[PDB]
Symmetry: C2
Subunit: 349 residues, 2 copies
C-alpha cells in the first residue's frame, strides 16, 4: 500500500514502472511534434523534447504516491512539463521579444489547470501560429485528467498560484536584456510583503520550478483532502524546495553564462560566501518544509536525488573550484561524485 | 580497506574500473595487430564481450593498494588469456584435446616465471598471432616474480590453474566423450576433495577467483605455507563452485535448446540440486569468513551472485526466478539490477 521509501524498492519501481511509463507518453508527443506545420514552432518543440527528457523523468516519480491513478497522473505531469519546456524554447529563441507574446503563451499553463477554460490562439502576438493543435492538445490533456481527480478542486487555487508565478518569471526574464532586472525587481515588489525575507533573484529562483504543481496534482488524486492540507502541501515545496533546485540549476551554468553574459541569478549576490551562506539557509528551510509533508521520507529522497543528479554533472565534478564549493553548499555523503563515476562507466560501456 | 556500500562503490568506480580500462584498452590495440584473421577475430570477440570479467577481477586490487597497478595488470592479462582460449576451444573446427591442452598450458607458463615459451598453437592451423599470447604470458611472469610471497603461493596457484585447464580440455571434446573424461578426471582427485559428484567438482574448478586472490596476497611480505593454504581454501572448492553452478543455472534453457553440456542436468531431481546449492552457499560463507578482510570478500562474492541472478534469463523465466529465490537470499537487488540494465540497454 505505502509508497516505497527504502532505496532498493524505490529505485526498482523508478526503473521498472516510472521511466517506461514516462517515455511511453513522451514518445507519443515526439511523434505529434514532428507533424507541427510551422517549421520554426516544429523545430522548437522537437528541440525541447530532445534535450529536456529529465524534467519529465523526475516529475513522473511522483506517480509512485498515487498508484491507483498512475498512468493518468504521469500523463498530466508529462503534458504540463512538455508545455513548460516548449514555451521556454519559444520565449528564449524569439527574435521579437514581445512580453505580450510570452504572456499569452504562458497563459496556456493556466488553461491546463482550469477545466472548461476556452482555448484561444496562444500564438496571437507572434508570426508563427500553425502548430496543428499541438499546444491545445497538451492543454486539453491536463484539463481532461485533472477534473477526474477527487481533490483537484481543493488544490486548484494553489496550483494556479504557483503556475502564475512561474509564468510571470518566464515573461520578465526573456525581454530585451536592459529591461529584465527592472521588470524582475518590480515584480518581486508586488509579492515581497507576503514572502519570507529574500532578494528578487532568490524569489525568481523560488518561482521557476514545477515540483509544487506536480505534488499538488498527486495529492489531488486522493479523496477528502482539506483546504488546510492543500496549503501544507504547497508550503512543503514553495518557496524553499523550489528555490534550492533553481539555485542549483544556476550554479551549474555559471561558467557558460559568464562566457556569454547571460542572465544568471547567482551573480547578484554580494560575494560567494553570501551565496553559499544563503544556499545553506535555503537547504535548512527546505529540509524543514519537506518534513511537514505526508510521506516525508519519499519527498526527501526525491529532493535529494535531484540535487545529487545536478551536482553529479561534469560541469561541477571536473571543475576543481565548483566541486569544492558544492561540498560546502550541501553534504551528500559522496553521492554526487559516485553518480559521476557511475555515469562515466555507463557511457563507456 | 572499504567494507561498506558507498565508499566501496566509490573506490570501484573511481579507481578500479578506469585502471582496468587503461590496460584492457592496450590489449585491444595488440589484438587488432594479430596477423591470422581467425585468431584476430576470436581475440577481438573475447575482448568485446568479456570486459566485465576483468572489471570484476580488478576489484581485488583494493586489497593491495601498494601494488595496485601491477596486480591489476596481472589479473587482466590472465583473464584475457582465459577468455581468448575459451573462444579458441569453443569455436574449434577440430575437437582435438592436444590442441586444447597445449593452449591451456599458456596459463601454467604465465604462473611459472622462467618457463620457456613454446608454440601453444602447434596442434592447429591458426598460429600467427604476432606474439599476442606470449606477451600475455610474459606480463604475468614478469609481474608475479616481483611479488614478495609469490613463491609461497605458486604451488596453490598452479594447482587451481591446472584444474581450470583440465576442465577446458574435457569440456570441449566431441560430445559423447565429455562425461567419461570428466568422470575419470574427477576420480583422480576425488580422494583429496570433500564429498561431491563429478559435475559439482567440474563447477568448482571453472573459476579464476582463487588465482586472483592468491596473487593479491602474494603482494604481502612473509606469507607462510599454512597461510597460503587458508587463502586457497577460502575460495576452493566452495566459492568457485557457487560461481559456476550459477553460471550453469542461467544457461539451462539455451543448453536444452542446443542439446549442450550443462552440469546441473545430472542431479537426480530439482530438490537435490537446490539442497546441494544451498549447502555450497553455506560452505562458501564459512570459507570466506576464514580469510583476512572477510567482509570485503563476502561483498565481492555476493555482488557476483546478484549480477548473475539479475540476468534476463533468470528474471524473465518464472521457473528459474522461483528457484533462484529458494536457492539464495538476495533481497531485491537482482531485480533492481535487471531493471537498471533493461533501462540502459533499451
Amino acid at each position: 500500500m505505502k509508497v516505497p521509501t527504502q532505496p532498493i524498492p524505490l529505485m526498482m519501481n523508478i526503473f521498472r514502472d516510472v521511466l517506461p511509463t514516462v517515455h511511453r507518453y513522451y514518445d507519443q508527443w515526439k511523434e505529434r511534434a514532428k507533424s507541427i506545420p510551422d517549421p520554426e514552432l516544429r523545430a522548437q518543440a522537437l528541440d525541447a523534447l530532445e534535450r529536456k527528457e529529465f524534467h519529465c523523468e523526475g516529475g513522473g516519480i511522483y506517480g509512485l504516491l498515487a498508484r491507483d491513478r498512475f498512468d493518468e497522473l504521469i500523463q498530466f505531469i508529462i503534458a504540463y512539463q512538455i508545455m513548460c519546456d516548449y514555451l521556454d524554447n519559444l520565449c528564449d529563441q524569439s527574435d521579437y521579444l514581445d512580453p505580450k507574446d510570452f504572456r499569452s503563451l504562458h497563459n496556456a499553463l493556466l488553461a491546463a489547470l482550469t477545466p472548461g477554460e476556452p482555448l484561444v490562439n496562444y500564438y496571437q502576438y507572434r508570426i508563427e501560429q500553425e502548430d496543428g493543435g499541438y499546444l491545445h492538445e497538451l492543454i486539453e490533456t491536463c484539463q481532461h485528467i485533472l477534473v477526474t481527480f477527487p481533490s483537484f478542486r481543493m488544490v486548484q487555487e494553489n496550483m494556479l498560484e504557483l503556475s502564475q508565478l512561474y509564468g510571470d518569471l518566464q515573461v520578465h526574464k526573456h525581454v530585451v536584456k536592459e529591461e529584465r532586472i527592472p521588470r524582475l525587481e518590480a515584480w518581486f515588489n508586488e509579492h515581497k510583503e507576503k514572502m519570507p525575507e529574500m532578494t528578487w533573484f532568490e524569489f525568481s529562483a523560488c518561482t521557476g520550478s514545477t515540483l509544487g504543481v506536480y505534488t499538488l496534482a498527486t495529492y489531488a488524486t486522493k479523496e477528502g483532502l482539506t483546504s488546510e492540507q492543500a496549503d501544507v502541501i504547497k508550503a512543503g515545496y514553495f518557496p524553499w524546495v523550489q528555490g534550492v533546485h533553481l539555485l542549483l540549476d544556476y550554479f551549474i551554468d555559471q561558467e557558460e553564462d559568464i562566457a556569454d553574459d547571460e542572465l544568471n541569478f547567482l551573480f547578484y549576490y554580494e560575494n560567494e560566501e553570501q551565496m553559499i551562506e544563503r544556499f545553506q539557509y535555503f537547504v535548512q528551510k527546505a529540509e524543514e518544509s519537506l518534513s511537514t509533508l505526508p510521506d516525508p521520507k519519499f519527498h526527501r529522497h526525491i529532493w535529494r536525488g535531484i540535487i545529487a543528479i545536478y551536482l553529479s554533472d561534469e560541469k561541477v565534478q571536473k571543475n576543481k573550484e565548483l566541486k569544492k564549493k558544492s561540498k560546502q553548499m550541501i553534504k551528500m555523503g559522496g553521492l554526487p561524485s559516485l553518480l559521476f563515476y557511475l555515469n562515466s562507466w555507463i557511457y563507456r560501456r
